[PDB]
Structure formats: structure tokens, C-alpha cells
Design a protein around this ligand. Sequence first.
Ligand SMILES: OC[C@H]1O[C@@H](O[C@H]2[C@H](O)[C@@H](O)[C@H](O)O[C@@H]2CO)[C@H](O)[C@@H](O)[C@H]1O
Ligand SMILES: OC[C@H]1O[C@@H](O[C@H]2[C@H](O)[C@@H](O)[C@H](O)O[C@@H]2CO)[C@H](O)[C@@H](O)[C@H]1O
Ligand SMILES: [Mg+2]
Ligand SMILES: [Mg+2]
Ligand SMILES: [Mg+2]
Ligand SMILES: [Mg+2]
Ligand SMILES: [Mg+2]
Ligand SMILES: [Mg+2]
Ligand code: NA
Ligand code: NA
Ligand code: NA
Ligand code: NA
Ligand code: NA
Ligand code: NA
Lengths: 204, 193, 1011
Amino acid sequence: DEANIETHGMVPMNRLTDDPRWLPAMSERVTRMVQRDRNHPSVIIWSLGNESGHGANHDALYRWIKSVDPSRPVQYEGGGADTTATDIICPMYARVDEDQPFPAVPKWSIKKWLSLPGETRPLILCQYAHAMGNSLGGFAKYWQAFRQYPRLQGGFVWDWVDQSLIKYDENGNPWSAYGGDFGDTPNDRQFCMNGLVFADRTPH
Amino acid sequence: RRDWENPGVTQLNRLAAHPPFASWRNSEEARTDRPSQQLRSLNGEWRFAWFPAPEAVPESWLECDLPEADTVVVPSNWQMHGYDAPIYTNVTYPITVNPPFVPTENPTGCYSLTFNVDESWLQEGQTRIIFDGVNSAFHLWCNGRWVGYGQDSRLPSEFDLSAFLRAGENRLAVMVLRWSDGSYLEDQDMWRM
Amino acid sequence: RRDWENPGVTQLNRLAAHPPFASWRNSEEARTDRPSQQLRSLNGEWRFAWFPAPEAVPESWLECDLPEADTVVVPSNWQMHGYDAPIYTNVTYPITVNPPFVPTENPTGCYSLTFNVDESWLQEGQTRIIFDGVNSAFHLWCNGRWVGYGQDSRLPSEFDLSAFLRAGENRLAVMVLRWSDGSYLEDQDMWRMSGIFRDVSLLHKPTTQISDFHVATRFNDDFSRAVLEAEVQMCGELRDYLRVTVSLWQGETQVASGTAPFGGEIIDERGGYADRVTLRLNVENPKLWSAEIPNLYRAVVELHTADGTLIEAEACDVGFREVRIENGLLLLNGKPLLIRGVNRHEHHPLHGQVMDEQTMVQDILLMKQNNFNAVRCSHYPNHPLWYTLCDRYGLYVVDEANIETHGMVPMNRLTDDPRWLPAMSERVTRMVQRDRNHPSVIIWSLGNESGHGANHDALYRWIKSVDPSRPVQYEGGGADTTATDIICPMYARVDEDQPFPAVPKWSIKKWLSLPGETRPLILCQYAHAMGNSLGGFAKYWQAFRQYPRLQGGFVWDWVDQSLIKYDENGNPWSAYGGDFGDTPNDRQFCMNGLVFADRTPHPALTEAKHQQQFFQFRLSGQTIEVTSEYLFRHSDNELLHWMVALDGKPLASGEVPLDVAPQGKQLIELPELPQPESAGQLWLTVRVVQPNATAWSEAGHISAWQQWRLAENLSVTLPAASHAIPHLTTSEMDFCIELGNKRWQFNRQSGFLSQMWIGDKKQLLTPLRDQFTRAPLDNDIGVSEATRIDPNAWVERWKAAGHYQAEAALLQCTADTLADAVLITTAHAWQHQGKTLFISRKTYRIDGSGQMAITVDVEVASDTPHPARIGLNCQLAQVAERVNWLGLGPQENYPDRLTAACFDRWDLPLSDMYTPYVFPSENGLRCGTRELNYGPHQWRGDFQFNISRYSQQQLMETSHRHLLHAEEGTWLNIDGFHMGIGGDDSWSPSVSAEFQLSAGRYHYQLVWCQK
Ligand SMILES: OC[C@H]1O[C@@H](O[C@H]2[C@H](O)[C@@H](O)[C@H](O)O[C@@H]2CO)[C@H](O)[C@@H](O)[C@H]1O
Ligand SMILES: OC[C@H]1O[C@@H](O[C@H]2[C@H](O)[C@@H](O)[C@H](O)O[C@@H]2CO)[C@H](O)[C@@H](O)[C@H]1O
Ligand SMILES: [Mg+2]
Ligand SMILES: [Mg+2]
Ligand SMILES: [Mg+2]
Ligand SMILES: [Mg+2]
Ligand SMILES: [Mg+2]
Ligand SMILES: [Mg+2]
Ligand code: NA
Ligand code: NA
Ligand code: NA
Ligand code: NA
Ligand code: NA
Ligand code: NA
């Protein structure tokens, strides 16, 4: 269960989440969620949001949850996937054997990540294997690694269903549309369709 | 006040958050998770009019239905009814980055509903309204009087309407802003509606 | 909108918080900290009108002055101008608890000011107004148009007035609400006042400006190298020709300087901060800052263009020091501190809560002179100047957020509620944003007495995360929660546990070692100096010295919060809770200071000074070993003076220069002790004197002392045959003795000495009778009240037992004539409801020499509460100018508070023998006295005494010192034994067992003779 906090378009990504003036607004997004969902057994882990860098607001909120609900781990991927705001190493799109050593926020091979000096946390990818179009090549490589390494405990595939929308042609026949098909611009075109299933639930 | 351009105001008069309630008045119903007569759905046909900015909304709408409005089902996203376009942008914000401000042409959906309330709900007790999801911020009025405001498009906003309703017919008016300072915290890679 | 009843709205249009700015446009002025033309004070004469509620404020006031207003000075608290009454309530909120609402009758102060603004401030740049302190919330209008709103009475609220002002005359309107939802977070134990009580100023900054800067100093392992790192942020349009230069100065020498254009390092997938830049300056062998030697450098941050043109400059003092907790110890520059601290409220008896530099400096100097090295800002961020003075004079400071919700039930009802997280967060974040560059701040505190809630844990981590350089502490919820790096209890005792449920206060020695505990423990409040208090203070100090992890504490507290009131005649007097009609109130509980409101010291201050000395001594043989407790400085401004005296008469003395390294020892051998030619006890006193003046003391300043007994030669020499023999005259009702021109009369029905004559002059106004009670101290009373008795308080135990009502019943009174003397024997029982509480047996033996030897043997029933004292008292007929004694002094001292006192011969004017505590009680005792002289009388023995124009009766019946009146003659209380005064706290019995008169049978003897 994840708070409705994502500030991906900011520059740098944590510009708001490291800003105390935004702590109140962010706090209610996390606190109100826990207040509502904390009795559901299906929720096993809380998340502080998505792609909002790593800011001090995150640290404060991570502690708040740990204090009010010790029954479930808290994770958050922003800022490098392994900051002080996450009980779990939860990278997005980290590769199995190949490192992608981006500055400040590298995406290490998952097998290697587990063993960096001083690291001891479990690793569960928050997003992996981007099912956009003809894809999922390399999927088995993740599973073989998850089964061999105890601390590689899986992941959440990206993602379930294509976000395509239905439009109607001149003849009234329906068709699947994506970014820019409504005159929207700028837009990110087909990147809104990354699911294992089509928008109507037919499997890819 | 332009509360929608102030991250210091994320709500006005909203009630505290809490787990799912239904106020059963029969324990066996509560045991089996049966529908509660105390928890009523207001989903169905509502009145809706679209405006290009909050500044364009007529004062008359607070007290009376706009003749030009249409009847539409709720819940719904107004883009899906064709009133304006949905936008698919991944990382880049769909509005200029100038926190906490939002554009002056800010699509405003004016929703209203005339509905009945039985005297029995008003003779004792508290009657609250619950909006489980309103994107991205809104003000609420009941029978012409202002009740409150809320942000966070993905959690329920609840208001006590006890002192605002009367037996019989009543009318809600909800002014929903497409963009708000909450939009700054809602940049997920998905259609913007 | 009623924004003042919504914790969700703590401000509207308020600008971000930042460190002190002045927008100098000349770098040298910034270097020297000179007044800046871009920072104007708007303090002075303002207009003001009081209203009972915001609803009563006329709308005309926004546009123009109200003719009914008065002209008053700002800053001020309106209660100090007489507009409404200040309230003194401790825990109970001064308003009904019904968050977030406040009373409808809400005193509103309408202040306004018409002033000029130069077009030069408006033609370019930004003009903002800064309210350093507005209690408790306020709306601001400029030229009739609404600007913004602000809460938090203890941090500055700033607003941009650029668009509201016009060249020439302008008018500000400030509506200040006494009560707001902010008041729920401002329940500290002090007077409840309101108003614009800190500075109001206007600051002009350029459009392209420094909007914030943080300075950090990190060191290598032995502090011989440091890196100064300065992160600077800007507002305005970014341009490639912009630069920031940060230069570091040590006096006139430029130690380092670095320049760079804006553009920070990559932080995440989206990049870095194009509007910030970090300059790193290397510093070799930096001069380190500490309270011992507050070395400071000056950092100047200049925003300019590449061609060299200055845009503006900001600056700050920098102190190179590292604070860290390691292996359970709080270290400063790698050495463990011993905090000799005190809590200090911002209080002035005339001006209320408005602070001035003079009072601040006065406080700091008395503190330092009294061996304090640290101060806790109980319980809110202080006026900005305070931190400047602590940085420069040298004091460690605990900076504390203005959050206290003591009156809630339970105490954390709001702090554990996420809906109050926002409001609380601003009280912590804005404080850190303002004060983080001050070297004197070594620890952050999350507030006070607010229980322990999840909001505390969230804010604890926020701080840890943004400023790793300083530990975070917080006492609420048990003093050792997950929200504190330091175990920091309030009023935990040294050896005794107070196991309250859920938030027990353990003995401090035991607390350190509870299972799994490893942190340092520094009391955030200890030894409550209310009234005649500080009993047992030495016990804390002996434990802090013995246990490494006991690293000191902050005494409660610095200064009495009494306020001045004026009687019919216009004469001033000190007032406390309820004296303004305020009710409910907590009476004298607002006076807990080491000093009176006017800065005069109470006697307890000297005890603190002595227990907090920086030099320890031991004596062996002729050898004195001095050990320095300084961590960083050598004793380079100290000389040891020693003096040997026999019963007060000096025999020898000298001086030796001290040259001891920090933590080192120096041995000093006294020269051979020539023998004395008289019986008597030789005593050695040593003192540490500072020959040279300093920024905080005058030449000659004494910083430490100690005494020891040396050889004693008991007198074995027989007096000598008396030239005369006293005669006894027996009559039915009296036994009279005559000797020369003196006569004594013992009444046979009362069994006491009722009269004594020198010639035809009577010496007594009241007979000499035993006394087992004292006018109750604040500590004896505790929370007890007539309207609500605390039966466990000492005063209630004594009352209930009949101690104050017991009457002497005579058992025996006989007279015998001996070879050279007459002997009177008496026995009395004191009873109550038929129980014998005390029995006193005595002999008075009057001899040929005229001396009357009195022996007293008392029995105290075991089941009666131990008595306050066991002595005699009388009202002498005459009054004399001086009091001279051989015993401990010169100041007032009690059994559990006499370490600072020295044995010697003292002589003071009688009035100095009375301590004017605002709430009167037993006072002025001196203990360990072997001889006392007053008028022609002399008493010799080994007793404790007090002497004054006020009876115990009067003191106990009078609640305010200004109402006491000198009685005829002089009341003398001479005690064989006197109970300790306690003070670990002033709301529960706190006199340690060893200081209670529980022995059951007591003996003392005194000789009264003429001089
Ligand atoms: O389904 C899209 C996916 O995008 C990832 O973001 C990518 C983005 O698509 C690409 O244009 C840019 O080069 O890199 C971004 C990664 O830094 C998001 O991380 C993921 O959450 C999805 O939104
Ligand atoms: O100077 C007073 C002191 O009060 C303490 O609180 C006491 C209070 O005085 C007593 O009336 C109540 O019965 O017990 C309280 C302790 O729980 C505060 O702890 C201290 O901060 C001071 O305010
Ligand atoms: Mg808002
Ligand atoms: Mg039914
Ligand atoms: Mg009707
Ligand atoms: Mg994203
Ligand atoms: Mg408010
Ligand atoms: Mg308190
Ligand atoms: Na595994
Ligand atoms: Na996508
Ligand atoms: Na110690
Ligand atoms: Na007090
Ligand atoms: Na010296
Ligand atoms: Na008294």
C-alpha cells in the first residue's frame, strides 16, 4: 500500500520532498493512508510513494510509520533504492547481472547489490521487467536469480494492464488509443502501455 | 483564498481519517458484512457542467441547478464523457512547473445532486458525506452553504453535514478543480484526468 | 475564516525561515558585523487599542488610526501596559481545553504604525517586514490591504511588503490574538502574556539574493585539520555570470576563500540544484571553539558577478567544534563534557517577556561568574541576540522548539495525533532553519512536557537527517524514549527511585545501567530553586563527578518570574500568581530562580558556584593537590591563595601561581606550620583568584575555594576562681539569681527564663523557650493548599501532629545552690490531643563569672513526624547594628546546603541576616557556629542560628515579603539541630533521610554571657 506522493518531474527529483514546507501535505498523504488501511491483513508493507527522490520529509515519514505500526515494513525506492527511508532494497529495473552505474543513484546488478559493503537488507524490486509491447525478454534470468539467492525475494513486474483508452472512428468502430491521441501535448505516446494484459484484460 | 494554490491548506473542515465504517445497528449484520442501512450510496445520476476556470462559475449554481448542465453518471472522470481531453505524460508535469501555482485556465467540473434525507437521520446523530475519490481538489457546499475543501485525489474526504441538511430534499454542489497544489504530488506516469 | 482555530493553518503568505540576514552591500561591513543600512528597526512608538474580541475591531482601523488608541512602545506585552492581566498558571491551560477552539472573548491587541519608506527600497529589490515575536497569532495589513497571518509566538514571521508599499508614508495594521490554536502548543509554566514583544524590522534584499546558507565544520582525528563547508542557495534569475565567494577570517587575517558559480552536484535521476552551490575551505590548525575558550572566525558569503560587482553579502560567526555522542558519552572536540547548566526563561520584572541586550549580558556574566557553562532555552527559541552572545562569551546551548502541551490529558493527546504533526513540525523545522549556524547550539530539543507521541519520533528523525552535527534530545514520555539521544530526566534524584507508573523517574545512578541502556544522562531540569532551596545540591555534583556517563544537568531555574506591582504610595513590590486577579493560578510556583527577578542572587547561587567549580583539591600533609576539570584550557589566569587561621585569627598565608594543564594536577607544598600559642582549631582555606580581567569577570575574581580542618588543640586550662558567687532568691512564683549588676529570673509556673537584666535594663521581650517548628519553606509546603491539603507534605504532617499547636506543660523546676554557682533544673513536655510529642530537660548553671551554661536534652516520640528543628528562641529587647559570629558563612546556609559556606569570623549588618524571599519562610540560618555576638550578648556552643526583626509566627502568616513589618526588638532562634531544606523538587517531600531529625534523643549545650 503506497502513499499518493510522486514528484517525478521536479528538478532535482527531491526538490519538494526535501522542503519542509511540503512536509505537511506529504504527511497527510502517508498518515491518512495508514489510518484507513492498517486493519487489512493483505497489506504487508507500506510504501512512502514513488519517484520523488529522497528528501528529509521521507525520513520523517518513514519513522512516523515505524512508530505507529511496527507490524509492517516500510519501503521506498527514491534516491537510490537503498536509502535510510527503506527497510527493503527496492530498485526499479535493476538488472540481474549487469550493473548500470549512474552517478548518485546507480542501479547495481541485483546479485551484486545484496553484498555491497555493510549491506544486509532483503532486496525485492519495486518494478522490474517492463512489459511494453513485445517484451519480457530475459524474464527467466530474474527468476533463476531469485531462486538461487535467499535475499533476492522477488519483485513486482511492470506492469499489469495497458493504459490504452477506447476512441471511435468515423464508422463508430472502437479503437485503442495512447498518448497524443486526444490532442494532448506534450505526450509520451505509447509508453502508457506496458502491461502483461491488454486494457480489456485479454493477455499479451 | 485560492486554497488550491497553497500547500499549507490541504483541507478545510474535513473529518479525521479511519478504517472502513458502516455503523451497523444490528450486530449479526456486522458479523456477516451485510449492507448497512446507515451507509447509503449517492452514486448514480448527478448534474454536471464544465467551466474553463473557477472564475467562470456562476454564483447562481450554488443555490440552483444550471439549466445548461447535463445529467451524467457519478463516479466518472469528466474526460471520459468528452468534456475535455485526458493527457498522457510520463515524467514531465502536465502543467508549468511553478509551485505552488497552477494555470489560470484550470478546468473546473461543477457537480451537484438533489437527494432526499429522512428526518430520522436528522433527529439524532451525525450525518456525514464521504467522497472516496475526487481529482484533484474541490470545495463542497450543501444547500447553498459552504461546508469545506479537500485535496489528495486517492483517499476519502469526509464532512459532517449534520447542521446543513433538512428533512426531504437537499442539494449538494461540488466544485472540482482539475489542477491544484496537490497536482505537484500527483505526477505518476498515467493518464491525467 | 477564523484561521486562529485551525491547526491546519499556521500561517498565510509567510516567507521561508533562514539564518540571520542583514543584506549588506559592502563586504567589509559584513565582515565586521556593523549595522546595515538595509536592515531597519521599526521598534519605538506605535499606536495601540485593546479589544475584547476580534469581532469588536472596527473596520475603520484598517484604513486609519483610531482616535481612541494610545501611543505605546513596541516591543511590549500588553499586560505590562495594564490593558489586561497577565495569568500565571503552571500545567492547567489558561483556556478551556477544547482543541482547536479558543474562547470567544479573545483579547485582541490592535497595533499600527505610520512610517516612511524610501523610494530607493521600492524602485528595485524586495522589502520584507520581520516580526521577531508576536504572541500568539496575528493578521497583518499594509496600507489597508491584507498581507498574511502567522503563528508560533517564538520564531520570526516575515512577509514580503514590496507590492504593498509606496514611497513616503505608509501604515501597518497588526491584529494580535491572545489565544489561537497555537496556544495549545504553548502551555509552558510561566506568565501567559501577549503582544508584539520582540523586534519588528524591515529588510531590503535584492531580487537576486542569497536565500539561505548552512555552514558545517568537519575535522580529522586530532582536530589539527578542518574543512569548512558552506552550502549557499539563491533566489532570482540564474545567470552564468553569477558567483558566490565564501571567505573565512580570523580577525583581520583572511584564512581562506573560495569562489564558484551556482550549480550543485547531481543528487538524483533528475539532476542537482542549479540554484545552490557548496564551497569547501581547508583550514589547518583551526582555533577550536568551546565555552572555555570561545574562539570564533567570521564567514562572509558574497553574491556577486564574475566581473567582480557585489550584489550583496551575508555573514556569520563560525566556531570550529564537533559535537558527537560516542560509546555513551557526549563529547565536544573529542572530550567529554560536564554540563554546569541552568534553564533560563526570558523574563524581566518590568518589561515582562521582552528581552534587551543589557539584561542578557547581565545574565550571561552572572552565569559565567557563577561557574555555569551551559544554558537550556526553557522552552522555546530565544530572542536572536541570545545566540550571538552565547557564541561570543561562550556557553553551550540547548535550543528548544516552542512546543509544550502539558495541560492535555494524557500529556501526548496532541503529539501522538497526526493532525497536529504539521503545526508541530513548523515549530521544530523553522527553529533549526534559523539557528543551525550558531556554534553555541550544541543540542536540539523537541520541546517540553508534551508526553511522547509519534510526531516526536517523526521530528526527531527529520532533525537527525538534516543536521547530523548535533544530538537531539527530548524528555517527554519517560526521558529515555526513542525520540532522544540523551537520557534527560527532570527531577530524577541521585540515589532515590520514584517509580511512577509508565514514566518512572529512576535514581540517575541506576538509570544509566538499566538493562540494555547505553546513553549519556544529562538532567534537563534538576534542583528546583524555589524559595529557600537547593538542599542536596552537592549530592548531584558528587555523582556527576564519580560516573562518567552522568554528564551534569540544567538547574531549574535561573531567574524568578516575579512581576513588579505598586502599592498605594507608588512603592514597588514583587508579585506572583493570582496577584493580578488571575484565576485559577499557581501562586508562588513562578518563582524558582537562583536569582531574584532583579538579578540579585539568592543564597543558593553560591552553593551552585562552589559545587560547579573547575578545580578539585585534596590535602595530604602539607601537600595540596589541585586538579583541573577544564578540558581545553591551561590555568593561565589563576593563582592559588592559602590562609591558615586559628578560630578566625589569621596565622599565615601565601600565594602560588597555578599552572595546571586541562585534566592535569599540580602539587603545592605549604611551608612549615609554626605552632599556635592558644587552644583552638586551625583551619586552612584556599581560593583560586583570577588576577586579570576577562570578557566576563573583573580582575581579582574568585572562581573556586575549599577548606580543611588542620590541627586542633583542645583547651585543658581551668578557668580561674571567681571573685564573686551568684546569689539565689527564691519566691513562690520565681527563682532569681543575682550576680554583680546582672539578674536572671526563672518563672516557677512556666519553667522558663522569663527576664534577664543588665543593671536596670530588661533584655527580653519574650521568654527563652524551646522551639520545634519553623515557618514553612516552599519545599515544606509543596502543592498543599488550604482549599486542598496535601497530607503528605511536611507542613501538613507537622500541623496534623500538633507541632504548631503543642503547648509546654511543666514537669519540674528546681533550684540548687552549688559551691560557686546556682543551678536551675527544668523539665517540660509538649503535648497534643493527649500525646506527648517532645520532652525537654535542661539545667542552667550560672557561675561567679556571670556565664550561664545551658544544657538541653530533648526526647522526640518516635511516631511523631520528625520536627523541623530542636532549639530555643526568644525575642531580645534590644536591637543592634551588627551581627558577628565564628561559624559558617557569610551567607545563609542550611544542613543540606552549606558546602559553599566557610568557617571563619564574619560580621554583617543585621539586615544581611535576613533573606528576603518573596514568599517568606524560615530563612537566614547560619550553621556550624561556635560563637555568636549581638549587642552586649555572646552565645557559645556548636549550634545553628538565625536572627532578625521578624518572628517565625509572622513569617508563617505572611505571604509576600513587602507586607512584613519589623517587630520590636530582635528574634533569635538558636538551634541545636535543624532539618534539611531539600529541593530535589518542590512538590513532594525531598529532604533526604540523613537530614531528617530522627534520632529520638538530642543533646546540645550553649553558654550565654555578657560582652
Ligand atoms: O513506463 C515508463 C517508465 O519510465 C521510467 O522512467 C524512464 C523514462 O521512461 C525515460 O524516458 C527516461 O529516460 O528515464 C526514466 C528513468 O530514469 C520510470 O522510471 C518508470 O516508473 C515508468 O514510468
Ligand atoms: O516550577 C514548577 C515545576 O512544575 C513541575 O510539575 C509538577 C507540578 O508542580 C505539580 O503541581 C504537579 O503536581 O506535578 C508536576 C510534575 O508532574 C514541572 O514538571 C516543571 O517543569 C515545573 O513547571
Ligand atoms: Mg492547497
Ligand atoms: Mg433492515
Ligand atoms: Mg424542503
Ligand atoms: Mg514516474
Ligand atoms: Mg491556526
Ligand atoms: Mg510544564
Ligand atoms: Na530468493
Ligand atoms: Na509507462
Ligand atoms: Na560524569
Ligand atoms: Na515554575
Ligand atoms: Na596561572
Ligand atoms: Na510565609
